[PDB]
Structure formats: structure tokens, C-alpha cells
Amino acid sequence: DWEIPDGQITVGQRIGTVYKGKWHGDVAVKMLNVTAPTPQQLQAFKNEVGVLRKTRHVNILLFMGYSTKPQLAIVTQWCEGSSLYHHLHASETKFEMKKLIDIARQTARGMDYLHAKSIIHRDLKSNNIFLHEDNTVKIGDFGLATESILWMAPEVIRNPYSFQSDVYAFGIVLYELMTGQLPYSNINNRDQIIEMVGRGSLSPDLSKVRSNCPKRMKRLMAECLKKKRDERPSFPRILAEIEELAREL
Amino acid sequence: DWEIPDGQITVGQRIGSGTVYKGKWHGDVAVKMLNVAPTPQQLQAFKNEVGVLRKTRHVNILLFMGYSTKPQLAIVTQWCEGSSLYHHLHASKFEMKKLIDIARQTARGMDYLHAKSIIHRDLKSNNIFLHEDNTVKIGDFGSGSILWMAPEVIRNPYSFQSDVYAFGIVLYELMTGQLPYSNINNRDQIIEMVGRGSLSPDLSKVNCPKRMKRLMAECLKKKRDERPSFPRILAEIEE
Numbered sequence A: 001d002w003e004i005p006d007g008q009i010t011v012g013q014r015i016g017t018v019y020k021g022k023w024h025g026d027v028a029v030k031m032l033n034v035t036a037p038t039p040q041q042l043q044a045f046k047n048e049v050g051v052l053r054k055t056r057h058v059n060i061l062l063f064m065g066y067s068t069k070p071q072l073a074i075v076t077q078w079c080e081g082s083s084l085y086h087h088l089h090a091s092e093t094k095f096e097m098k099k100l101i102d103i104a105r106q107t108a109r110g111m112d113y114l115h116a117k118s119i120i121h122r123d124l125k126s127n128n129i130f131l132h133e134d135n136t137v138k139i140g141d142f143g144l145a146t147e148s149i150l151w152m153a154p155e156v157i158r159n160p161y162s163f164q165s166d167v168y169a170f171g172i173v174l175y176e177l178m179t180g181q182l183p184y185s186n187i188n189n190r191d192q193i194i195e196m197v198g199r200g201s202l203s204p205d206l207s208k209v210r211s212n213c214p215k216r217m218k219r220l221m222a223e224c225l226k227k228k229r230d231e232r233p234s235f236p237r238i239l240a241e242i243e244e245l246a247r248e249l
Numbered sequence B: 001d002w003e004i005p006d007g008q009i010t011v012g013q014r015i016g017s018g019t020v021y022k023g024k025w026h027g028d029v030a031v032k033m034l035n036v037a038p039t040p041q042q043l044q045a046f047k048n049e050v051g052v053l054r055k056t057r058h059v060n061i062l063l064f065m066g067y068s069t070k071p072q073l074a075i076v077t078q079w080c081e082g083s084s085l086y087h088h089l090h091a092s093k094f095e096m097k098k099l100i101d102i103a104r105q106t107a108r109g110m111d112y113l114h115a116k117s118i119i120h121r122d123l124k125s126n127n128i129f130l131h132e133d134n135t136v137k138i139g140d141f142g143s144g145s146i147l148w149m150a151p152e153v154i155r156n157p158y159s160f161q162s163d164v165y166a167f168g169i170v171l172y173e174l175m176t177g178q179l180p181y182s183n184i185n186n187r188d189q190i191i192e193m194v195g196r197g198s199l200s201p202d203l204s205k206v207n208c209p210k211r212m213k214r215l216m217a218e219c220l221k222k223k224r225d226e227r228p229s230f231p232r233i234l235a236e237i238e239e
């Protein structure tokens, strides 16, 4: 059992619900603050716990246990540092290419691991990628996994979710790394992007990628961003490629 | 199941000695090949040990990732960058802040194991890996090194308290920067002297927090029952 007997966790400050806590060291706790969970609230809990229970990988957020009796709660490791979103989009400090490649590799290993276990993340984005101690990638925020608009494949815009969708979202994450920007800087209208990406009249501007960016990465990026879902690569190939060029330079 | 099918793991360089290898499996892994052809008698003795590692989910405990049974029995875990606490301490200057942090993390790992009712039985500086030279990873809990052995172990010999004694020796390593009884280079003497209670580590060789030394002395008690529990150990180190 991964059920942590309640009263063993010293809950602390709020983060966003999620609390930093104390349980044999630093932990993070996601507490559903309801009086009595909906039948839907219960299955969402069981599902997230069931999928977390099957993950043991350094690039996946470490699940540590759950609580049921007082409230629904999911306990994971405590990550120090910020999300990839914050580092790229909301911070002055920008990364060297070698690290950007490394961040890409670590994410791909995690995604490759998940897909090997028949798990679709369905919400991969730079915000769900935690740079633990600013070096080690941790894929997390597992609210929707099974067994955010800018990171959506056209067939998710228009079951839409698949391994292929996870690949597209990973493609956008790559675009973030290699540009430092979010896709569609021109568009400020939600419903415009939705229609345009959905139709296939729109795609990320790969001309914006850094001059340093290896052509191998740029090519791969384009592949993961293919509008036809079945034309997109699988993570074994994605990881292989990223691994190839990482050694290459 | 956590069994990794035959072939999925690509084995690389021999790291040390079952036998440990670096490998590839959805990224880097470490593969410990067991000194084993397996009999049905040994198979369910092997899975018994995996079932213990199966219930460890903690950042300061080396991440168990899965096992193999073909071609041979193997434990698969995460790969750690950098070297053990032993190598840093006895083969190559941590600021006191980091030493305490290293001590802090080991207590977290141990406290967790004991809460999970798991006795390590072999805690020591070389079973404490420094991943990225920051994060402590405790492994190897699934003739011998006697420096970390509690007096009751030498002569329920293996208990939570004997783990605490081992941690004490580890605290001593961190604070002195050297192994106990360096003055005496004789296993048989150490075995006899520590076993009979006539010898204990020399605390004259420890800028060390005086609460730490008290705690270190508390862990190093020859009397098994005079030793604190890890929750108390963790609480005092944390504070």
C-alpha cells in the first residue's frame, strides 16, 4: 500500500491545491479541499494514483503516496527550482545550447518511458516540466494522464488524444527551447489560433530558432509538429535522434 | 509487474563488483547482475528482495526501476552521476554547510526506511552515492566492512539501532574526514576491541555544531538501547 496514514504529514505553505509539506523530509502535497468528494472526484483520484503508481524514472515526478480519509491527497517529492516555463519565458537567465539539448533529452527519456508503459500525458507543456535544482528535468502535473492551447495538436483542437498528441506537445516544448519564445507571437486571440491550427493553415515559425540550433534538432522539431498525426515520430526515434546529435556536438 | 523483458536493456561498462554495469533503458540505468543459472528455489528468494525495494519511493533512496530474470537475475536502478560519499571523503573539501546537508539527507532516507520497517543492515559511506554531488542516494540494502558495525552485530543482532550506529560512524566520517581507528590498522584488533566495548571512535578528530557531536555520540552508544531513533535523529539535525 502507498496509502500514507493521515496525520503523518505536516502541511505547510501554499503554492497554487498544492502545499509544501514535511514527511521524512520535504514533500509536495496536492489536496482536494472539498467537504465530500464527488463520484467524479473519486475516479479522477484513483486514476491519477493508478498511473503514478506505475512510474519509476528519474525524469518523472516521484510519486510517494496518497491520502484518502480526510481529503483526497497525492504526495510527491519536493522539487526545488522553477518550471521550464518560468526559466524560458518569465526569467532573465537564458540557457546555453548544450543545456537546451540536455533539457530536451531528459524530457524525451521521460516521455519515452511513459509511452513504453502505455501512458499518455495529454498535457505536456513547459509549465509541467520542473527543472529540479535547475539541471534535472521532472515531468509532472499528472492531472490528465491515462492508461494549454499552444501545446495542442490540430486533431486535439478539432478520442483526439494519443501518443501522437504527446509528440506534438513535445514538439512545441522543443520550439520553446530552441526559440526561447511561445508559438504564435503574432496572434493574441485564442479563437484565432484554434481555428488556424485546427485547419492546418498555421504552424510554429521555425525561422525563429537560434543560429546555434543544430539542423538535426530543427528537422526533428518539424517532424514532431507534423499536421498529420500519423506522420509524427515515436519517442524511441525521437530519443534516439536527440541522443545522436547530443554526442555529435 | 516491474519486470523488464529480455533485450530491452543495453548493458555497457563494468562499474564495480553481484556485478554493477552502466546501461541504457529509456535513458541511463545501473544494472546489478546477480552472481547466478537460477533454480526455482532461488527465484522466489530473489523476488522477495525485489518486493522490499518495490516499496521504496523516496528522493534520498536510490530509485529502484525494475528487475530482469533473463538472461540472468538483475536489479535495475537509476544511474547516479558522480561518486560515493566514501570517495569524496577519503579520496578527494566540503563546506560544513554541505556536510550537514549530506548528513541531513541520509537521516531522511534512513527515517523513511525505518518507517517502512526496513533495516538497511549495511549503511556506510560507499553505500551513500552523491548524485550530481548534491543529492544523497542510499543503496545496497536489498570478508566485510566492520568499521560501521555496532558492537552487538560483531559478537535480533540486526536492528534499527544497529542502523543508527552505522549512521553514527557516517556522521564521524563527515565530521572528521577520515575512517575510525585509523590509528589502529588491524581488523582483528578492531573486531575484538569494538566487540568488547574497549574501543570507540576518537571524537578528538572532529567547526562542528556541538549538537551534532552530542548526536554523533548518541548514535555511537555501545549500549544498543541508549541510541536515539531516526525520527529524533532527523528532528535534531533538521533543527
Ligand SMILES: CCN(C)S(=O)(=O)Nc1ccc(F)c(C(=O)c2c[nH]c3ncc(-c4cnc(C5CC5)nc4)cc23)c1F
Residues within 6 Å of the ligand: B015, B016, B020, B021, B030, B031, B032, B053, B061, B062, B063, B064, B075, B076, B077, B078, B079, B080, B081, B082, B083, B084, B129, B138, B139, B140, B141, B142
Ligand atoms: C535501489 C537500491 N537497490 C535495489 S540495492 O540492490 O539495494 N542497491 C543497488 C542495486 C543496483 C545497483 F546498480 C546499485 C548501484 O551500485 C548503483 C545504482 N546506480 C548507480 N549509479 C552509479 C554507480 C557508480 C558509478 N561509478 C562509480 C565509480 C566512480 C567510478 N561508483 C558507483 C553505482 C550505482 C545499487 F547500489
